[PDB]
Every structure is written in C-alpha cells, then in structure tokens.
Write an enzyme that holds these catalytic residues in place. Structure first.
Site, PDB file in Angstrom:
ATOM      1  N   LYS C  12       0.857  -1.216   0.000  1.00  0.00           N
ATOM      2  CA  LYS C  12       0.000   0.000   0.000  1.00  0.00           C
ATOM      3  C   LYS C  12       0.879   1.246   0.000  1.00  0.00           C
ATOM      4  O   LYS C  12       1.886   1.333   0.727  1.00  0.00           O
ATOM      5  CB  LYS C  12      -0.837   0.020   1.293  1.00  0.00           C
ATOM      6  CG  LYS C  12      -1.981  -0.941   1.275  1.00  0.00           C
ATOM      7  CD  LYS C  12      -3.168  -0.358   0.609  1.00  0.00           C
ATOM      8  CE  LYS C  12      -4.162   0.379   1.616  1.00  0.00           C
ATOM      9  NZ  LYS C  12      -3.611   1.625   2.200  1.00  0.00           N
ATOM     10  N   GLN C  47      -5.900  -9.188   1.827  1.00  0.00           N
ATOM     11  CA  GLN C  47      -6.753  -7.999   1.764  1.00  0.00           C
ATOM     12  C   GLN C  47      -6.850  -7.579   0.297  1.00  0.00           C
ATOM     13  O   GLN C  47      -6.001  -7.911  -0.524  1.00  0.00           O
ATOM     14  CB  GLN C  47      -6.136  -6.847   2.592  1.00  0.00           C
ATOM     15  CG  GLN C  47      -6.074  -7.000   4.030  1.00  0.00           C
ATOM     16  CD  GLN C  47      -7.118  -6.338   4.796  1.00  0.00           C
ATOM     17  OE1 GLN C  47      -7.982  -5.610   4.295  1.00  0.00           O
ATOM     18  NE2 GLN C  47      -7.060  -6.587   6.091  1.00  0.00           N
ATOM     19  N   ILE C  48      -7.919  -6.879  -0.026  1.00  0.00           N
ATOM     20  CA  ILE C  48      -8.193  -6.458  -1.423  1.00  0.00           C
ATOM     21  C   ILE C  48      -8.169  -4.945  -1.534  1.00  0.00           C
ATOM     22  O   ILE C  48      -8.699  -4.256  -0.633  1.00  0.00           O
ATOM     23  CB  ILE C  48      -9.512  -7.048  -1.915  1.00  0.00           C
ATOM     24  CG1 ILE C  48     -10.664  -6.754  -0.965  1.00  0.00           C
ATOM     25  CG2 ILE C  48      -9.403  -8.485  -2.191  1.00  0.00           C
ATOM     26  CD1 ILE C  48     -12.034  -7.092  -1.632  1.00  0.00           C
ATOM     27  N   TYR C  49      -7.549  -4.432  -2.586  1.00  0.00           N
ATOM     28  CA  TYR C  49      -7.410  -2.989  -2.752  1.00  0.00           C
ATOM     29  C   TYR C  49      -7.503  -2.617  -4.222  1.00  0.00           C
ATOM     30  O   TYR C  49      -7.093  -3.381  -5.116  1.00  0.00           O
ATOM     31  CB  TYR C  49      -6.028  -2.485  -2.282  1.00  0.00           C
ATOM     32  CG  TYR C  49      -5.734  -2.840  -0.829  1.00  0.00           C
ATOM     33  CD1 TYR C  49      -6.312  -2.119   0.218  1.00  0.00           C
ATOM     34  CD2 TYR C  49      -4.859  -3.879  -0.538  1.00  0.00           C
ATOM     35  CE1 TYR C  49      -6.027  -2.479   1.573  1.00  0.00           C
ATOM     36  CE2 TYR C  49      -4.546  -4.211   0.715  1.00  0.00           C
ATOM     37  CZ  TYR C  49      -5.072  -3.502   1.768  1.00  0.00           C
ATOM     38  OH  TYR C  49      -4.713  -3.885   3.063  1.00  0.00           O
TER      39      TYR C  49
END
Lengths: 58, 58, 58, 58
Positions: C12, C47-49
């Site tokens: 991220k 996790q998805i982004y």
C-alpha cells in the site's frame, strides 16, 4: 468479563495469521465477544476476530 | 466524547456502501475514532470504518 | 492490460500498511481494477485494494 | 476447473451472511480456490471467501 484488554499483544491461533495489539471490541449475536487487532507488521491495518480465534502472547 | 453509541443505525457516506448497527469501536493512530458496523442486510457480517466515513440515519 | 501479475510483491502506498504478493484480482464499478494481496508477514491473510492504492516493490 | 464464474449469484452457506455477485478470484495455500463477492445489498462492498464457504443461488 473481558478476556483481553486494550494494548494486549495477541495472535490468531490457527488458519490465517495475524498478530498485534488489541485496539477495540465488538459484539454481535454470532460473535458475542470480538476484538479488533492492529497488525504489528502493518501499522494502521486492523482485522476483527472472535475471542476463540485469538490467544495472548508475551 | 463518542459520536455514536451501540445500536445506532448508520451508513457509509460515500464509496462502498454499508448500512446497519453500531456493534463496537476501535482506536488506532490512523483511526482514533472507529466503529464496527453489523450489516442489516447480511446478519453476522461486520465491517470497521473511521467515524468520518459514517453517518447516522433514522 | 493488467498493472500487476500473480506473485508480484506490492505494498500500500499510503494510509493503512500492507505488503506481500498478488494472489488474485477483482473488478467492480467502484474498483474496475482491484487486487488481492496476501501479507508476507501474516501468511494466509489476504486484503483487497484498488490498483491506485498499491505499488510494486522489488 | 473453477466452480464459479464472473457474475454468478452466490451466498455464504453458514455463519456470517453475504450474498451477491462473483467479481473476482484469489488463490493462496490456505485458500487455493477463493472468490471475491460484491454485495447485492451494499454496492461497492466486496468480501473474499474460500469456495467451500459459498453456494450458487438462482
């Protein structure tokens, strides 16, 4: 009374890993005692789990 | 003092939708006032958001 | 065409931290190019982004 | 070969509820066949689950 308190260091016991500090709590019928845990590896990322999924470490 | 209390009905203001009841809280440096919200459409599923992302409805 | 491929190491860019390998993809109207990222610190947790939130590293 | 395809309508079989359309996929050692599902009640919100947790509906 609550199994963990704010700031306890905890990890997931099994399955998907997670480790870090207790930073909150939640309660639903499916999860009457749940905790929010901020990762110690990934600051700012928080995941929520039932108490049975977690164990306290040092 | 806290913007929402347990059981308040809230929704996400923008972006990805979510609506349901406050069922907990969390606090980190990135999100000093966050809430857990159980969906009213999908019982048992809980998502966590900063207070700025949420608004109270009826 | 796709910005990342399976197995790319990404993190991220800002806000909540996350770092690990691309392990899948998703597409919705809000997120027309999204990725699933398995943490390299917490095996099994994903996790998805949106693509705009991620950058490739080594 | 894949149990679901893009756009299938699926729901969680048990525990926390979720229902909506398949919008992606992921693969890890813990979850070698996983899917991303966009809620039909909460547009834009996506959750990821192992195939064993999901069933196709209409």
């Amino acid at each position: 009374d609550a199994t963990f308190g704010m700031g306890d260091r905890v990890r997931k016991k099994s399955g998907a890993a997670w480790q870090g500090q207790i930073v909150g709590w939640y309660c639903t019928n499916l999860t009457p005692e749940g905790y929010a845990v901020e990762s110690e590896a990934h600051p700012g990322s928080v995941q929520i789990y039932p108490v049975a999924a977690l164990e306290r470490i040092n």
